[PDB]
RNA sequence: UUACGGCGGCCACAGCGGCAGGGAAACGCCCGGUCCCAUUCCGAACCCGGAAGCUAAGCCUGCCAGCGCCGAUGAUACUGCCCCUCCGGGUGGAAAAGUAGGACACCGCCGAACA
RNA sequence: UGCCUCCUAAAAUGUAACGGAGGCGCCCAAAGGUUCCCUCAACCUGGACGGCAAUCAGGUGGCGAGUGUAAAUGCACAAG
RNA sequence: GUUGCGUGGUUCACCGCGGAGGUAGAGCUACUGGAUGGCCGAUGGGUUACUGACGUCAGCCAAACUCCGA
């Protein structure tokens, strides 16, 4: 039982009915999945995303990612079709709540010169995306066993209908917004 | 004078189309519709063929129909 | 007037039979020239009729050309025998059937408008007439 | 006001429509509220005059073999070259329904400055009771600068008459030159 | 596919220099992750030229 | 919705195998409809659309069978394997319904292959 | 007889959208991953074991012509044959478009509640 | 100059010109067989590098994508 | 074409019934292109009188356009 989940159904599940007046408890929003990907565009050249993007997202998240191939060739990017350019992991269930708790507690303040995340980065339904800029945010990877530094952007897909409904959920979980 | 050096050629006409019309009595094995693609689809007692050739599997009578937008050829034994 | 692309550079002739079933009333303006017989109206003939209407009213008013020359006609080189390919396209032509409104005009004076259109009909290879908005 | 004497057609077709026109008559139909359509002749010049006055809407009183019937003119088929009525669509009315009618917009005003006045639509389709049907509804220009353009919205239409065309039909546009 | 391809993943204790301690499931070998700053002790989590001339004189 | 996705996707799979499998008078079609609690089965004869035999888990004989949901799939597999033989049927074609062959549906199918039906 | 669950015919007059209401058994979301089985990563899905919760959604029912769809009668275009120098005419067929309108489907077998 | 596809070609088939447009003399051990599963392009919103457009997430989208290769006839049930 | 030997109404015409079409015509916010006048206005240009995309409102065209269709 991950501790961000038992904290979710204790007071977060009940505080949302009093802010947004739902009739039924099957309308209370909940985060369904957290998707992290790298997007290693500098792997069309030199073809080294093996130790780079695969072996650190296994250490950050806990399971081995999927490698995403390119769908159409773009000449200016020197990109050919069917060439690995992206590395993606998808987190459900207990490994999701154990990622979001580990992200907001000990990782999201390790951003250099951190003054909060924007609360306007919702797409229109209540799904939040923000981008990390380095791997040293996480202790689970080390600076001395890695290749070149690379960032990642993290989707948090919720059951929310609109944005401020999804903003009130992630505020109650512990996302820091400015 | 110039020339039509770029034109002047054609392939042979392939004799495509309906070979047995509606209500017409056929034998087993008779070719009903010769076509490119499925302009017509098989029905009951009709098979497609290797180059979409819609023959007869059973002696009977040819009847045309509709089956969810597609037009089909069937045999009533 | 000339198209900027055609899909087919060499075409058959448009067919001069029938009565016009579309474009047979005055839509845009007040006065209109209506065709009474079949002809091929080239783009050189339309521009001679546009400058003939515009130089008789000289300012004030609005001229509509609801006819475009997008059908090409071909021509062999000059002193040639018959038949070693189709000739290169030379003319641009609109197919004009009886009933088809060709030009439309708005002008405040009825006399000058009806006289500016008469000068256009003497620039066209058709018998035509002037009609109004019923 | 419009006494129009009709007679029921005997035989119908391509041949009988031509023979009725050589007698100066106009073929037409009368279809209305859920009835079978009537096939009937028109006296021609007496029908051509009654729409030459009174507009084209012009509520008609018919004489269908001794029987009286009120009819609006739904559609006309004009020959493109002879400019003569070939066929008429007449629909019955009863003393006020919300039937739909296009009616001409006449334009008033003076383009004082360097302004040309252009009109795009000639008639708006309003809905009104089936015996009033105003002759035309006007529009005016107060000396409009090249600019502000008048629309089907902000037209002057009386009581009972409702705009159901579109409230954005540009009826008059004013420009430079 | 959910067998011996994924990295090892078991229970892991996290402590901060502030005095925070809680218990998650992570990939650190031994389960002894130690942070210098966390969600409890970080800033942002708890928090004129006319006066320049006046200060000189 | 996840149920709106699941209904459309399983009847798209069920139309996918319907292109190659019909069911006739001599050889009816054993259609299974599997839910989270019960399973249903019937023999449909797709020439006039007339069911000739049916069985389910909601009737009181299968309702009082002990065990998991696979033990109640064998019992309903036994019932249509005799209501068909009472109706004069000894060969059928098996219809997945759009589900995967295996688990509870294969246990219905193995109870029907032992008690007389010959697919 | 059902504001029931299936399987078909049928493939928009049947769709798409809007607004309401529905939960006996059933259909579902749902709660879990020990066992069969599963993810180019993920028990999301597929599969299995369950019945704490709920009609919010699907599904069903009713109402809306809104966007789509169907669409005459008459007339015209075109046309077979014939007469006729053209023009046109006689006889036999006859659109597309638009209009009057229609339409928020209908039918069959099995199961359940009721008969 | 042989073969293949379209228009001419006059709603079966067939139809000429030194008439109007194009392709072929290959390629694939999978791009064959079967079994099962999936739905596209485009547009919109959000997102470290990252741009009109790489990878991601949510919408919308009944086929405008795709099909080894010309074109026609087909194929969303998929033949993708 | 004719003639010998066979076969016999199987040929042909009209009436009725069952069938497949994509020509004439017509239509195009049903596709691919061409294209007139407006309105809106991407961006380009010289700070905004010029270009005026995509859309939308009317009227049109096509052997190699077709939702239709004799
Ligand atoms: Mg050919
Ligand atoms: Mg072959
Ligand atoms: Mg037209
Ligand atoms: Mg119940
Ligand atoms: Mg689960
Ligand atoms: Mg509800
Ligand atoms: Mg008719
Ligand atoms: Mg029609
Ligand atoms: Mg022919
Ligand atoms: Mg032919
Ligand atoms: Mg060649
Ligand atoms: Mg293979
Ligand atoms: Mg090939
Ligand atoms: Mg395939
Ligand atoms: Mg006959
Ligand atoms: Mg017939
Ligand atoms: Mg026919
Ligand atoms: Mg064609
Ligand atoms: Mg034509
Ligand atoms: Mg166009
Ligand atoms: Mg424009
Ligand atoms: Mg055509
Ligand atoms: Zn601390």
Curated annotation (Swiss-Prot), chain A:
Species of provenance: Mycobacterium tuberculosis (strain ATCC 25618 / H37Rv)
One GO cellular component term noted in the UniProt record for this chain: plasma membrane
InterPro entries: Ribosomal_uL5 (IPR002132), Ribosomal_uL5_bac-type (IPR020930), Ribosomal_uL5_C (IPR031309), Ribosomal_uL5_dom_sf (IPR022803), Ribosomal_uL5_N (IPR031310)
Database matches in Pfam families: Ribosomal_L5, Ribosomal_L5_C
This protein's UniProt keywords: Ribonucleoprotein, Ribosomal protein, RNA-binding, rRNA-binding, tRNA-binding
Functional note: This is one of the proteins that bind and probably mediate the attachment of the 5S RNA into the large ribosomal subunit, where it forms part of the central protuberance. In the 70S ribosome it contacts protein S13 of the 30S subunit (bridge B1b), connecting the 2 subunits; this bridge is implicated in subunit movement. Contacts the P site tRNA; the 5S rRNA and some of its associated proteins might help stabilize positioning of ribosome-bound tRNAs.
GO molecular function, one term: rRNA binding
Family designation: Belongs to the universal ribosomal protein uL5 family.
Recorded superkingdom: Bacteria
Name under which the protein is recorded: Large ribosomal subunit protein uL5
Entry's Gene Ontology BP terms: translation
NCBIfam families: PRK00010.1
Subunit structure: Part of the 50S ribosomal subunit; part of the 5S rRNA/L5/L18/L25 subcomplex. Contacts the 5S rRNA and the P site tRNA. Forms a bridge to the 30S subunit in the 70S ribosome.
Curated annotation (Swiss-Prot), chain C:
MF (Gene Ontology): rRNA binding; structural constituent of ribosome; tRNA binding
Organism: Mycobacterium tuberculosis (strain ATCC 25618 / H37Rv)
Region (Disordered): 1-21
Name assigned to this protein: Large ribosomal subunit protein uL16
Assembly with partners or alone: Part of the 50S ribosomal subunit.
Alphabetized UniProt keyword annotations: Ribonucleoprotein, Ribosomal protein, RNA-binding, rRNA-binding, tRNA-binding
Biological process, per Gene Ontology: translation
Gene name for this UniProt entry: rplP
InterPro entries: Ribosomal_uL16, Ribosomal_uL16_bact-type, Ribosomal_uL16_CS, Ribosomal_uL16_dom, Ribosomal_uL16_sf
Swiss-Prot record, chain D:
One GO term describing the cellular component: cytosolic large ribosomal subunit
Superkingdom per UniProt: Bacteria
Secretion signal, residue range per the UniProt entry: none
One of the record's GO molecular function terms: 5S rRNA binding
Region annotation (Disordered) ranges: 1-20
UniProt KW keywords: Ribonucleoprotein, Ribosomal protein, RNA-binding, rRNA-binding
Biological processes annotated in GO: translation
Summary of the function given for this chain in its UniProt record: This is one of the proteins that binds to the 5S RNA in the ribosome where it forms part of the central protuberance.
Description of how the protein assembles with itself and partners: Part of the 50S ribosomal subunit; part of the 5S rRNA/L5/L18/L25 subcomplex. Contacts the 5S rRNA. Binds to the 5S rRNA independently of L5 and L18.
Family that this chain belongs to: Belongs to the bacterial ribosomal protein bL25 family. CTC subfamily.
Protein name: Large ribosomal subunit protein bL25
Parent-record interval covered: 6 to 182 of 215
From Swiss-Prot, chain E:
Gene Ontology process terms (BP): translation
Keyword line: Metal-binding, Ribonucleoprotein, Ribosomal protein, RNA-binding, rRNA-binding, Zinc
Cofactor names: Zn(2+)
Cofactor remark: Binds 1 zinc ion per subunit.
Amino-acid positions noted as binding Zn(2+) in the UniProt annotation, renumbered to this chain: 16, 18, 38, 41
Gene Ontology terms: cellular component: ribonucleoprotein complex; ribosome
Gene Ontology molecular function: metal ion binding; rRNA binding; structural constituent of ribosome
Subunit text: Part of the 50S ribosomal subunit.
Membership in a protein family: Belongs to the bacterial ribosomal protein bL31 family. Type A subfamily.
Function statement: Binds the 23S rRNA.
Protein name: Large ribosomal subunit protein bL31
Organism the protein comes from: Mycobacterium tuberculosis (strain ATCC 25618 / H37Rv)
Gene name tied to this protein: rpmE
């Amino acid at each position: 039982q991950p501790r961000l989940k038992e904290r979710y159904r204790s007071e977060i599940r009940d505080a949302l009915r009093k802010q947004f007046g739902y009739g039924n408890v099957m309308q209370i929003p909940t985060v369904t999945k957290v998707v992290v990907n790298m997007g290693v565009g500098e792997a069309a050249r030199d073809a080294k995303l093996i130790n780079g993007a695969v072996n650190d997202l296994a250490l950050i998240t806990g399971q081995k990612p999927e490698v995403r191939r390119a769908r159409k060739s773009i000449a200016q990017f020197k990109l050919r079709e069917g060439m690995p350019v992206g590395v993606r992991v998808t987190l459900r269930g207990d490994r999701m709540w154990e990622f979001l708790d580990r992200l907001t507690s000990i990782a999201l303040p390790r951003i250099r010169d951190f003054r909060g995340l924007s609360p306007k980065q919702f797409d229109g339904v209540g799904n939040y995306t923000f981008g990390l800029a380095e791997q040293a945010v996480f202790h689970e990877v080390d600076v001395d066993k890695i290749d070149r530094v690379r960032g990642m952007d993290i989707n948090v897909v919720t059951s929310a209908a609109t944005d401020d409904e999804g903003r009130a959920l992630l505020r109650a979980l512990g996302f820091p917004f400015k | 004078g110039a020339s039509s050096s770029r034109n002047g050629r054609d392939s042979a006409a392939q004799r495509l189309g309906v070979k047995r019309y509606g209500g017409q009595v056929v034998k087993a094995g008779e070719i009903l519709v010769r076509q490119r693609g499925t302009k017509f689809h098989p029905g009951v007692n009709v098979g497609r063929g290797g180059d979409d050739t819609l023959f007869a599997k059973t002696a009977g009578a040819v009847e045309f129909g509709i089956k969810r937008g597609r037009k089909t050829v069937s045999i009533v034994g | 007037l000339i198209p900027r692309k055609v899909k087919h550079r060499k075409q058959h002739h448009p067919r001069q039979r029938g009565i016009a079933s579309g474009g047979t009333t005055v839509n845009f303006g007040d006065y209109g020239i209506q065709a009474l017989e079949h002809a091929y109206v080239t783009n050189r003939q339309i521009e001679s009729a546009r400058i003939a209407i515009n130089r008789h009213i000289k300012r004030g008013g609005k001229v509509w050309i609801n006819i475009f020359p997008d059908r090409p006609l071909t021509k062999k080189p000059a002193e040639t025998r018959m038949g070693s390919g189709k000739g290169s396209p030379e003319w641009w032509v609109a197919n004009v059937k009886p009933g088809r409104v060709l030009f439309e005009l708005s002008y405040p004076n009825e006399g000058v408008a009806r006289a500016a259109l008469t000068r256009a009909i003497h620039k066209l290879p058709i018998k035509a007439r002037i009609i109004t908005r019923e | 006001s419009n006494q129009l004497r009709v007679t029921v057609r005997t035989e119908t077709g391509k041949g009988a429509s031509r023979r009725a026109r050589r007698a100066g008559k106009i073929p037409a139909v009368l279809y209305g509220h859920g009835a079978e359509p009537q096939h009937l002749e028109l006296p021609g010049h007496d029908y051509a005059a009654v729409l030459r006055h009174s507009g084209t809407n012009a509520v008609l009183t018919l004489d269908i073999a001794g029987k009286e019937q009120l009819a609006l003119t739904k559609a006309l088929h004009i020959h493109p070259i002879r400019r003569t009525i070939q066929h008429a669509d007449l629909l019955v009315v009863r003393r006020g329904e919300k039937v739909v009618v296009e009616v001409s917009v006449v334009v008033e005003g003076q383009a004082g400055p360097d302004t040309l006045v252009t009109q795009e639509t000639n008639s708006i389709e309003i809905e009104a009771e089936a015996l009033s049907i105003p002759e035309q509804l006007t529009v005016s220009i107060e000396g409009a600068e090249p600019g502000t353009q008048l629309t089907a919205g902000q037209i002057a239409l009386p009581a009972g008459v409702s705009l159901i065309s579109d409230p954005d039909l540009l009826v008059v546009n004013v420009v430079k030159a | 596919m959910k067998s011996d391809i994924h990295p090892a993943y078991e229970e892991t204790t996290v402590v901060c220099g502030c005095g925070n301690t809680f218990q998650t499931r992570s990939t650190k070998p031994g389960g002894r992750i130690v942070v210098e700053v966390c969600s409890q002790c970080h800033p942002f989590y708890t928090g004129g030229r006319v006066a320049r001339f006046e200060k000189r004189y | 919705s996840v149920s709106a996705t699941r209904r459309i996707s399983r009847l798209r799979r069920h139309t996918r195998l319907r292109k190659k499998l019909s069911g006739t008078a001599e050889r009816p079609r054993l259609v299974v409809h599997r839910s989270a609690r019960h399973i249903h089965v019937q023999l449909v004869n797709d020439l006039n659309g007339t069911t000739v035999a049916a069985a389910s888990s909601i009737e009181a004989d299968v309702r009082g069978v002990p065990g998991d949901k696979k033990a109640r799939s064998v019992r309903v597999g036994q019932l249509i394997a005799e209501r068909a033989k009472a109706a004069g049927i000894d060969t059928v074609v098996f219809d997945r319904g759009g589900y995967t062959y295996g688990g509870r549906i294969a246990a219905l199918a193995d109870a029907a292959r032992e008690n007389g039906l010959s697919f």
